[model samples]
Target: IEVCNKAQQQGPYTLVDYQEKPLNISRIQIKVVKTSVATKGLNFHIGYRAVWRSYCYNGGSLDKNTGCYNDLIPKSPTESELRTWSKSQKCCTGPDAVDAWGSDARICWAEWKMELCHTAKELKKYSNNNHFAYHTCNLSWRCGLKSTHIEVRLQASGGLVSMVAVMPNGTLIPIEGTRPTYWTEDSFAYLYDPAGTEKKTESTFLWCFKEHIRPTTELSGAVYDTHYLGGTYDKNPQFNYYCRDNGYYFELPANRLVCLPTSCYKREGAIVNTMHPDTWKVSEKLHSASQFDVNNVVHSLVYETEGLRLALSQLDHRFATLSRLFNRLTQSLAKIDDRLLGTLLGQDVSSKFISPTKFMLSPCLSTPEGDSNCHNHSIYRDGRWVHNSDPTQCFSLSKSQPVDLYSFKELWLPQLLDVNVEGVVADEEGWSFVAQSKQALIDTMTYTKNGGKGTSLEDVLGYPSGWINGKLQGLLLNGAISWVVVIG
Candidate 1:
């Protein structure tokens, strides 16, 4: 379809240009006849699925876009929706409102209902006539048929909006039940292995309860600091949103497991996995470095007084920028992508959508050679994930505001990679690991001549498809492409 979309950003930055690559329209005539052959129940998606390995498997939330401009500004109704959402009635702020209310926020206000400033003097001076635009990013499986109901409040003028994140074909909304399915505290997929001699594999993911906050450090676990999460900026949960996408296959393409991204997993740290039997044996004996997603480890290439200052300042800038941008909303939005929300916000998606989060990520050292206080302050204040969490803290405040700009020791808690595997599986006996590599464990749904489909890659590729001479992943060089496994 040819159309112009104007939402998300003021000037339509995400310019989406698509035109079916010059296929002769006339060809449709013949295709109509061929298409009539009737492939009754058939469709295809662009995301992959996994039966065992996930990246940010928080137990609470999923990766989806939900913010002021994208979430609140769309769906402006909430009579029947109040009861529809599972959040407490206290959070329900009446019809059309799901606010996390208050305003020491320094920016964002749902009550303002419009841009917060009329004169330049009322706003935080930045560059020029251009006001800052804050945002959050998250990843999720490409979806088409789900109702993503969102309720947002413009921080500047208290303007409110709400809407759905429904594509043309994916749907896991309202959580397959009644309660409005908002990601309270979500998790993510971390490990993906299918070559184990065991029946099941263990996995982990980090969860961020708060994604975007106002940028300050006030201590309190009591009544949430309204201004902390983006304050008057939003009335609903100033927490992160949930979303996902997936590709569809109907058969086995030689035992593959496809993993799709639908949200953010930004609780920065070194993911240390100790469940691999071989890996653990070596690590415990040698006390070496073992980490998952090494690409994520923060590094201070030249650890200089100058570099430290620069990094701290940069981090501070990011925080101030967030507060400034959110505080002003006197612009138009066009075509917004939810994925960026998590990235920009440094959020963590939980597995149990609404589990109470119990995590903290403050300024800590990136590497063993890094410093803890990039800008150390007697930090005060609070906030909180585990991937694959059962139903504990799902989405939380630590994932967002006032909290984002500072440094905490916990942010690097998981960075204790004494076992350098990209992902791992651990039970009681120990742990197993393989080198981190792309396409490690995949799941495919190929068209089996007969009416059959393997939902898991193991069904198609046997135990470990990477094996040779009839073995999976293998024993000698397995470390090259697979993670270790801990046997109970």
Candidate 2:
């Protein structure tokens, strides 16, 4: 189907046409051209493509002899004209053609291709019409295939544009001619996509009781800017007014402010009860008597019976205490024996030491053929132990050799006396003097004997020339006297 028209004025104009009978339309195109007109304002053009799919020839029957199906045909003049033109269009044997048979077994697929015929028309209303020109066409292909229902609308903005189609699944087919500059709504109409516009339930008011107020209660007026709508008004005691999205009434008492579904208030009355306070108090008294008073008397009786059993148990404990005391006395005697033997002999007294003769004559010494017998001793000889007796197994025992006596008197004695000596000297007159060395002692003795003119002690004592010196050296070497000593 096609529409070609011309606009005269400059205001917005919209052309809307709904399908008289849904067609199996596969393509649609819209074109708008601005003729040479006044150039003061901008020109605009808008188009819409509403597409949907449904089964073709639904609830219709096909004639077996004619191979023709009864369906609602388009009423547009262009559509009828296309059907007339398709009489000689030949059977469409292409891949998209549908196959059918007549009652006589003759091929009837040619009727299927009759819908593919194209129809178009052009007219010039005026020779110098310079306002706006628009053209739109819808093409169909019904080869016993799926069909779509489409609606198209066009409006003018004093300008020019172009547009496009699809299938029963709503797959868009690109237009064959010039592409449209833009679309008014969706670029391509979606078959299964949801509507772009959001829908909301309208708010309504109803009478609700004040006692039914809840967090979800919608007030009648703006809650953020005013409080009068939600405020309690005791003067008007009929019922409170609140908002709800549905039509439901809750009329219990007149104290509720919001109306909710009956299910919302079903759980409200479940916990209500009417028991007397005196009855509850009597129940409490009985509970206390059973749980506390009677139970406490039974527990006290059990505790007293356990106390009598404990008293009887104490008699057996006293006998155990006497046995423990006797065992302790035996241990004390054993400790005394250990203390006396260990202290006197400087050895721990074991059972073996209790009888010395028996210990000496133990089994190892009494049994000559035993493994531990002395006759089976292994002797260490030749740097190793051998399991045979060797009569020549003696080892050497000797002391460190002494130094030469002459060397001790001459070289060693002098070296030993080389240290400085501090000694106290006592002379024959019972006078005492301090000497710094051996020579100093001799000089002090000489001075004490003859007032610094007497001979040395060696000469006065009739000792050998080095006799006293040798004796002092001998005393130092033997550790009998130290270098610092008293000399009398």
Candidate 3:
């Protein structure tokens, strides 16, 4: 479980030193050393060479001298040993050759099928006399390897090399030189030599587990990005090879790669439904209900209705009082006329007093002289009497006849009362007439005989002079009128 690596700029450093209690071996150690210098490149000593030496248990107790289980040390194989091993096995005929050593290993097979594998001798020759060995197959399986389970001991004497092992269960154990040493039930180690000039290693053992050996079906619905694969440098061919080899699907409709999970087709309906626009369009009523409680709405409306009713009742009472005032004023005007008629009778003036009732009861006594003349008779139209008789002989009925005070009270009084009380007007012209008539009545009421002034209507009614007129004007300006009820 524990995997580690280390690096030192000088002579030597410990790369991997790890152990586990359940492992057959007590402990394992890998030490790195810079062997020789072959070049002095810009900024860094490029041609410097290094190699790893391993020590482990060999059927003996711990040795204090070597810090190994049995003190039996095995240094990385020399170039000659690698050549001897290469000749011992047959070279693969082609990349797809099933007879190739470790061909059954899926991790190695993926690399070999992609033409990343090379023979041991080719790799040695590429090392350039143990100075710099730069090849794409550093983490790849050697083409002539004997078995998948066998450890591929790498000597970084010339350039960097990566060590890894494949267990029987397809678990890959990578030897890395960049991780801190630790102990666990499952032990892992890694080593990398820095004394050679080369490009950075393109493959990692952890990546092999994800994209190569692990079954693709098991990773269904899993997500990954460039950072998860490695970093920005993941644009290389090896990363693409891993994705392509593992049957990873991608979508780039918006010019950004979206790595789709495997087995996505199984949840096709669910994904489509979740992404539909209608899923977000909840009904307005339902949304409103979510934001406001129904009980609160009902309670607020009840209070609003009660407030309106109380205001309406107050307005009704005010209107009733105005109507009574109009009635009283009309009566007062009639009483004044009656007193004048009585005074004239007492003086033997023989002045006739015609009441409104008698005026309405009067009949049409005179008739037209001829049938043609009947058409010239007066007729009521447009609220007035129109006569076609000779202008000098006949006058309008409105001028000749006595005034009908009852009809006058019924038709005009109610509206005048409404204007002053509620600022309500049925006719603008009639409102002006009513206002003038009201002022005349007030003048009459306030007039005095023998240089003694009488009380005005406002004083008699316990209001200030011009109080009613002021109230009406204020109501009109304030837009207090709520309803207009016309009387005819």
Q: Who wins the lDDT comparison?
A: 2
Report the lDDT tens digits of candidate 2 across residue range 1-488: 45656766568888786333222211111111112211221211111122111112112223223222323232112123333333533222212212222232222212222222222211111112111221111122222211112211121111222111111111122221211212222222111111221212222222221332223334575343122446632232222222222233334322221212111211112111122333323333432333344444555557656756876677678779889988666444544343333333444343233342332212212112222222335544332234664565434434557778744311100112233346665423222332325566787667676555444464555547466698788777766444344341
lDDT preference between candidates 1 and 3, better one = 3
Which candidate achieves the best TM-score against the true structure? Answer: 3
* Candidate-wise lDDT, in order: 0.25, 0.29, 0.28
Off by over 4 Å in 2: 1-67, 73-192, 197-488
Counted clashes in each candidate structure: 187, 10, 14
| lDDT of model number 3 | 0.28
- Give per-residue CA lDDT, model 1, range 121-176, as digits (tens): 11111111111232211111111111112210110001011122212122332111
Give residue 90's lDDT in candidate 1 (0 to 100).
Answer: 17
RMSD of each: 39.8, 56.9, 50.8
Model 1 residue 124 CA deviation in Å: 67
Each model's TM-score? 0.13, 0.12, 0.15
The Cα error of candidate 3 at residue 21, in Å, is 97
Which residues of candidate 1, in runs, are more than 4 Å off?
Answer: 1-308, 330-488
